[PDB]
Amino acid sequence: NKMEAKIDELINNDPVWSSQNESLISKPYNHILLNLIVQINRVMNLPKDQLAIVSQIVELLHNSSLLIDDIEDNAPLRRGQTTSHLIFGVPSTINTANYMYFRAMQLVSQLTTKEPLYHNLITIFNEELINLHRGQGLDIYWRDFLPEIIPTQEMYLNMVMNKTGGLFRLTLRLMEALSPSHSLVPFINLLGIIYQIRDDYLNLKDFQMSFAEDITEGKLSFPIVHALNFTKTKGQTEQHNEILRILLLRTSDKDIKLKLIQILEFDTNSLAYTKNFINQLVNMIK
Amino acid sequence: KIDELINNDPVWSSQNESLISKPYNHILLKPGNLIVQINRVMNLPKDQLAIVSQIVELLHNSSLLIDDIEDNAPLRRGQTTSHLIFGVPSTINTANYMYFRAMQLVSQLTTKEPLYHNLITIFNEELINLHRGQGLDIYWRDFLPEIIPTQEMYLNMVMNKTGGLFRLTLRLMEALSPSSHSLVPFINLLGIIYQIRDDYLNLKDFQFAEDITEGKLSFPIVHALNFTKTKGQTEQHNEILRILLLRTSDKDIKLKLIQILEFDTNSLAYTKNFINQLVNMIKND
Ligand SMILES: CCCCCCCCC(O)(P(=O)(O)O)P(=O)(O)O
Ligand SMILES: CCCCCCCCC(O)(P(=O)(O)O)P(=O)(O)O
Ligand SMILES: [Mg+2]
Ligand SMILES: [Mg+2]
Ligand SMILES: [Mg+2]
Ligand SMILES: [Mg+2]
Ligand SMILES: [Mg+2]
Ligand SMILES: [Mg+2]
């Protein structure tokens, strides 16, 4: 009866969860913790306690998405430090990241009571999280099943619209919806495309000038997509195949990585094409 | 084209949708209800009942895709696990994607905003509970031997972990029911019985016992370590810890652990009996 009584207590109450338990499971997230919203707000003009919550939400989603992305990308370093999954393990990191996505979601109701507005906010959250995963899904798929699919520039841009555009739009849309009041989404869409291609570009260019981890990862980056379609079109069979073989080695060898970068530089002219593309895009936004 | 591109919703084809769905479709191939029966009392319209079932189906299967990665499991329902076929990266992303697909189905449940908020909050709260309990199960396993849970700590972990999906299904139906106590306590007790039975059987069916290989603080193991600790049985206690920490696939070593659980701590019988008393709480109500 003494036991049957503890069981009765147990099942008749909400699950027990201590502040100690919360700290233990939060380790991966606290480790990775170690200005766009402020800017955008100069136009949206949201009261400050709402702006603070939009900020917590975007911060939880961004950091959590990086913990998962680093496991998905086999990344050794993030923000200058060892990635959380190498310290705490893949199991804990995945579970904590996923836990934080749901804590982010919980914060959405601290933004308002107005049932019409609430439904819209939750839909924005749900929509863009679906987008982010669809984009991340193709990015990973192309990479891990190469050469099953060789994306074209159009396929890559559409992937970036889902992947990169997801948190940019989530941030912008939440803020527009909370604003006492045309949409800046097309501008944020462009801003995100620039950001991603620039990221892909400098990952190689910084290396060529002096880790180019995107090559080790085997990612179908913007310059890489140009190089593979360029080589196919121009009948450069051997170069097409060598770009593929190197990507598939998942190599950390610095000379093999530089070889691939110089093929992009001298053989396909993918680096110049990409630098030009980014310039044409910045010109458009300006 | 850049102007077209940025002025429209992101493009996503059904072909793209099929690509990303492979890891999930894979776990769907191997079959394996309580819901239909309970509706005899909740009486949800058939269309809402289908949606609740689909929500629970997406969450359950996706959660198992993740659990198998976290547990380094080579087989699920007698078949190779999705992460060994499509890779860990795609499997995690697909599973997480389906969590959000499940979230989206919550809106097709009702138009009434008072109700809608309540359903999202139920969905949110139980996915939080699910992760809290899974995070504690994973923590004890991976930080062993830092913390050895007591039976009370284990049952609290189970209420969050296993109870999460059971309560989610039940609370969604109770919120949606057009009919006039709650079945939560019962579903909570069913969850506990379910978990302890999964832990008990993993070993008795051997007596593969993958739980040993995983190093999980299962119900029987929790009894064994707190038993050996309580009765100053130092060497037996450490031996249990040594085998769990080995992460062994060795049939002989595992049988050696089960043997200790059968004959020294008598944890298998302690567990079988615990289950019976839980079943008696219901079969005596
Ligand atoms: C569904 C989760 C999506 C998270 C997206 C995180 C992208 C991270 C990178 O932008 P980074 O590793 O250079 O920070 P990516 O290069 O696309 O892996
Ligand atoms: C946050 C997701 C939690 C999902 C928990 C799934 C538990 C699955 C098991 O019940 P199984 O591997 O025996 O099917 P567990 O023994 O606890 O890993
Ligand atoms: Mg990455
Ligand atoms: Mg990535
Ligand atoms: Mg990058
Ligand atoms: Mg498992
Ligand atoms: Mg598990
Ligand atoms: Mg199990």
Curated annotation (Swiss-Prot), chain B:
Q: Where is this site: Important for determining product chain length?
A: Y99
Q: Which reaction does it catalyse?
A: isopentenyl diphosphate + dimethylallyl diphosphate = (2E)-geranyl diphosphate + diphosphate; isopentenyl diphosphate + (2E)-geranyl diphosphate = (2E,6E)-farnesyl diphosphate + diphosphate; isopentenyl diphosphate + (2E,6E)-farnesyl diphosphate = (2E,6E,10E)-geranylgeranyl diphosphate + diphosphate
Record note on what altering L5G does: Monomer and homodimer. Monomer
Give the co-factor note: Binds 2 Mg(2+) ions per subunit.
Q: Where does the chain bind Mg(2+) 2? A: D67, D71
A GO CC annotation recorded here is:
mitochondrion
Cofactor(s) essential for the protein: Mg(2+)
Pathway in which the depicted protein is active: Isoprenoid biosynthesis; farnesyl diphosphate biosynthesis; farnesyl diphosphate from geranyl diphosphate and isopentenyl diphosphate: step 1/1; Isoprenoid biosynthesis; geranyl diphosphate biosynthesis; geranyl diphosphate from dimethylallyl diphosphate and isopentenyl diphosphate: step 1/1; Isoprenoid biosynthesis; geranylgeranyl diphosphate biosynthesis; geranylgeranyl diphosphate from farnesyl diphosphate and isopentenyl diphosphate: step 1/1
- Tell me which domain of life the UniProt entry assigns to the organism this sequence originates from: Eukaryota
Q: PROSITE patterns under this entry?
A: POLYPRENYL_SYNTHASE_1, POLYPRENYL_SYNTHASE_2
Function recorded in the entry: Catalyzes the trans-addition of the 3 molecules of IPP onto DMAPP to form geranylgeranyl pyrophosphate. Required for the membrane attachment of YPT1 and SEC4. May be involved in vesicle trafficking and protein sorting.
Q: Which PANTHER family match?
A: GERANYLGERANYL PYROPHOSPHATE SYNTHASE
Name the record gives this protein: Geranylgeranyl pyrophosphate synthase BTS1
Source species? Saccharomyces cerevisiae (strain ATCC 204508 / S288c)
